[PDB]
């Protein structure tokens, strides 16, 4: 009878355990997909938290995972992994079969990924501080950003989401802000500032956008999740009181309308109801 619906995971390297849980995504087929950067693996669960399967071969060769940070699920259920250390994005089948890698030689530190409304793969690079837009096949179609603190630049972007207008929503871990851009890279607006007040951050991480354009943002340093309207107005905190967060990372919205968070500091993921 809590905003918390369920919790899955504990510390370790076995199936249903985590060392460094970072990326979170959801499939329309009603699955939850999580990446562990330190166990170098992807784990797939039902919408109720039941373990389905784990995949990932450790290493630096194509097909293999070295530091998988960011994950996204395509409309066909393909699993898209940002590998920060291999410096590419791996696309797998919904069953964990390597298909191809995109952005090799262009991405220097791919951290976060999303899928847009035309099936483009959106990658945020924490080393070049840029946002890349690819076709599934690997073809680059767009790039914007650059290191800095101006509205068109990023200081250290780790996560990305796309809204109903195909607009790109980037969290800036080091700037304490969220910035929103057109599909073409045009800056639209920013919100958030450094602090603990409503609509302030101490290092934003995961981000998701709902069907109503509400933007949901995890706050790593403040161990909390904020919900905003489409203009970046604070609406609420997710009520985490029953089982507090500790350093949350990825965020995703499921097909059954729950917010799932990588509660990395507690070695688990948690699913929430939220009222919008």
């Amino acid at each position: 009878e809590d905003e918390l619906v369920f919790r899955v995971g504990s510390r370790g390297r076995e199936k249903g355990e985590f060392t460094n849980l970072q990326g979170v995504s959801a499939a329309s087929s009603g699955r939850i997909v999580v990446a562990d950067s330190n166990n170098q693996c992807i784990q797939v669960f039902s919408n109720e938290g039941q373990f389905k399967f784990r995949f990932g071969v450790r290493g630096r060769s194509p097909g293999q995972l070295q530091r998988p940070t960011g994950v996204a699920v395509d409309t066909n259920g393909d699993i898209i992994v940002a590998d920060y250390d291999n410096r590419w994005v791996s696309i797998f089948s919904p069953e964990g079969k390597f298909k191809t890698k995109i952005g090799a030689g262009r991405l220097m530190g791919p951290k976060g990924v999303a899928v847009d409304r035309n099936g483009h793969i959106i990658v945020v690079d924490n080393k070049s501080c840029c946002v890349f837009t690819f076709q599934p096949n690997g073809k680059l179609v767009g790039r914007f950003g650059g290191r800095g603190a101006t509205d068109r630049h990023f200081a250290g972007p780790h996560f990305v989401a796309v809204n109903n207008k195909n607009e790109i929503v980037v969290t800036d871990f080091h700037n304490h802000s969220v910035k929103v851009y057109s599909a073409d890279g045009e800056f639209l607006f920013k919100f958030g500032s450094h602090g603990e007040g409503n609509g302030q951050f101490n290092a934003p991480t995961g981000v998701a956008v709902d069907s109503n354009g509400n933007i949901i943002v995890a706050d790593w340093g403040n161990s909390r999740i904020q919900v905003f309207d489409s203009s970046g107005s604070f609406l609420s905190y997710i009520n985490t009181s029953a089982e507090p967060l500790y350093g949350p990372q990825g965020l995703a919205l499921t097909s059954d309308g729950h917010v799932v968070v990588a509660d990395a500091g507690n070695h688990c993921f948690k699913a929430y109801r939220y009222l919008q």
Side-chain angles (χ1 to χ4, degrees):
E1 297 187 319
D2 202 76
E3 281 215 345
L4 181 68
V5 187
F6 61 81
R7 177 198 49 76
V8 172
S10 61
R11 177 161 85 89
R13 303 191 180 276
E14 284 312 329
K15 296 158 140 155
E17 296 176 350
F18 304 105
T19 299
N20 189 12
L21 186 53
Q22 280 196 18
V24 186
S25 195
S28 68
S29 70
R31 303 170 169 194
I32 296 173
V33 176
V34 300
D36 193 316
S37 70
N38 189 283
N39 286 352
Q40 308 170 284
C41 77
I42 302 305
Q43 297 188 81
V44 183
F45 302 81
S46 74
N47 262 5
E48 310 163 66
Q50 193 174 282
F51 176 82
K52 315 270 232 170
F53 58 90
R54 177 176 68 176
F55 69 91
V57 189
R58 302 167 273 190
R60 308 202 106 98
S61 298
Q64 304 187 318
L65 303 172
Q66 191 51 31
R67 198 167 173 228
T69 55
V71 69
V73 178
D74 196 355
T75 58
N76 304 352
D78 285 3
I79 298 163
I80 305 161
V81 182
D83 199 312
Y84 189 72
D85 282 359
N86 283 343
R87 297 179 285 115
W88 63 55
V89 173
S90 299
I91 305 180
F92 302 84
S93 80
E95 284 63 67
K97 197 184 180 64
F98 183 60
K99 294 179 41 167
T100 203
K101 66 172 197 288
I102 69 166
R106 294 182 176 279
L107 298 171
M108 293 288 101
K111 187 77 174 157
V113 62
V115 177
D116 84 353
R117 208 164 141 156
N118 312 137
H120 297 300
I121 299 166
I122 311 304
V123 187
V124 291
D125 190 301
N126 187 51
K127 286 225 172 113
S128 55
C129 291
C130 283
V131 176
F132 297 75
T133 300
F134 290 95
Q135 290 175 350
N137 66 64
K139 179 180 210 249
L140 181 72
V141 62
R143 177 181 171 163
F144 69 88
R147 189 178 296 274
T150 58
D151 294 340
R152 66 172 188 156
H153 286 164
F154 304 103
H158 297 187
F159 298 80
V160 61
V162 180
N163 72 10
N164 297 265
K165 309 211 209 96
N166 226 28
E167 302 175 331
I168 302 170
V169 178
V170 184
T171 57
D172 199 327
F173 186 92
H174 277 312
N175 188 241
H176 305 298
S177 66
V178 178
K179 302 186 225 205
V180 183
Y181 302 84
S182 63
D184 308 336
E186 202 162 312
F187 172 76
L188 298 176
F189 68 99
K190 78 178 293 184
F191 67 95
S193 53
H194 196 192
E196 282 205 300
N198 298 349
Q200 305 182 325
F201 300 102
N202 274 310
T205 54
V207 56
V209 185
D210 80 14
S211 48
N212 292 327
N214 298 319
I215 304 164
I216 307 164
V217 188
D219 189 357
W220 177 86
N222 286 331
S223 294
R224 69 194 187 172
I225 302 166
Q226 293 181 77
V227 183
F228 303 83
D229 72 17
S230 66
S231 290
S233 316
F234 173 87
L235 293 174
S236 65
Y237 302 99
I238 300 296
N239 190 347
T240 59
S241 299
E243 298 181 16
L245 305 177
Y246 200 78
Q249 292 285 5
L251 221 51
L253 284 160
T254 65
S255 55
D256 64 350
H258 297 153
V259 165
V260 179
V261 63
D263 185 15
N266 288 321
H267 300 89
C268 59
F269 70 89
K270 293 163 167 166
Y272 291 93
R273 40 175 63 90
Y274 78 111
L275 63 90
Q276 294 81 15

